[PDB]
């Protein structure tokens, strides 16, 4: 077809309202603008692979994934994981000055939606650990479906 190329942009971003699993892994599929987000306790190579396992289940396997040069994305372990799946990986140009403003915008929209929803439910600070999962799933829903 002449349709979009299946390229994802992935990034992690800190959200203290979701502590203790405050690191949010966010993937924007650039062909559809669909967002996938998962929560993690630490920013490591394995949290990035667990996030991509879930995004693959939800959006299918991409042709390539663009990330920055965080070490969780360029370690040995993460390059071998992406090679086992046959997914090409680029961190773009060095000083590329971000060829990944989609996931950057997605991160701000996501944090804002989480703040609005949680305050609507009366949580002005950290969201109680047991309510976190349904709220994060409600923020993902709101940003993806109309």
Judged by the rule CB under 8 A, the positions of this chain that interact with a copy of itself are 49-50, 53-54, 56-58, 60-61, 133-134, 137-138, 140-141, 144-145
Tokens standing for 1?
A: 């077809």
Q: Closest distance between a copy of itself and the C-beta of residue 145, in Å?
A: 4
Question: Six-digit token pair at 97?
Answer: 């000055």
For the chain, the residue count is 146
How far is it, in rounded angstroms, from Cα 130 to Cα 67? 31
Question: Smaller CB distance to a copy of itself: residue 57 or 101?
Answer: 57
SS3 of residue 1 by DSSP: coil
Tell me whether residue 112 is annotated as binding: no
Burial of 129 (0-12, 13-18, 19+ CB in 10 A): exposed
Q: Which is nearer to a copy of itself, 96 or 134 (CB)?
A: 134
CB of 11 to a copy of itself, least distance (A): 19
The neighbouring-strand residues paired with 64 are 7, 88
Provide, rounded to whole angstroms, the least separation between the CB of residue 68 and a copy of itself. 23
Q: Is 11 labelled as part of a ligand binding site?
A: yes
User: Which residue numbers belong to the known binding site for Mg(2+)?
Assistant: 11, 68, 104
User: Which residue numbers belong to the known binding site?
Assistant: 11, 68, 104
């Amino acid at each position: 077809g002449l349709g979009p190329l299946q390229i994802w942009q992935t990034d992690f971003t800190l959200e203290p309202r979701m502590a203790p699993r405050s690191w949010l892994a966010v993937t924007v599929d650039t062909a559809s603008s669909a967002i996938v987000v998962t929560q993690h306790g630490r920013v490591t190579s394995v949290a990035a692979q667990h996030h991509w396992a879930t995004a693959i289940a939800v959006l299918g396997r991409p042709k390539a994934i663009k990330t920055d040069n965080g070490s969780c994305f360029t370690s040995k372990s993460t390059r071998e994981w992406l090679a086992r799946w046959g997914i090409a990986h680029t961190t773009g140009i060095p000083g590329n000055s971000q060829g990944q403003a989609m996931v950057e915008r997605a991160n701000r929209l996501l944090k804002d939606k989480i703040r609005v929803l949680a305050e609507g439910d009366g949580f002005m600070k950290r969201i109680p650990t047991s309510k976190q999962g349904e709220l994060l799933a409600k923020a993902m829903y709101a940003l993806n479906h109309f």
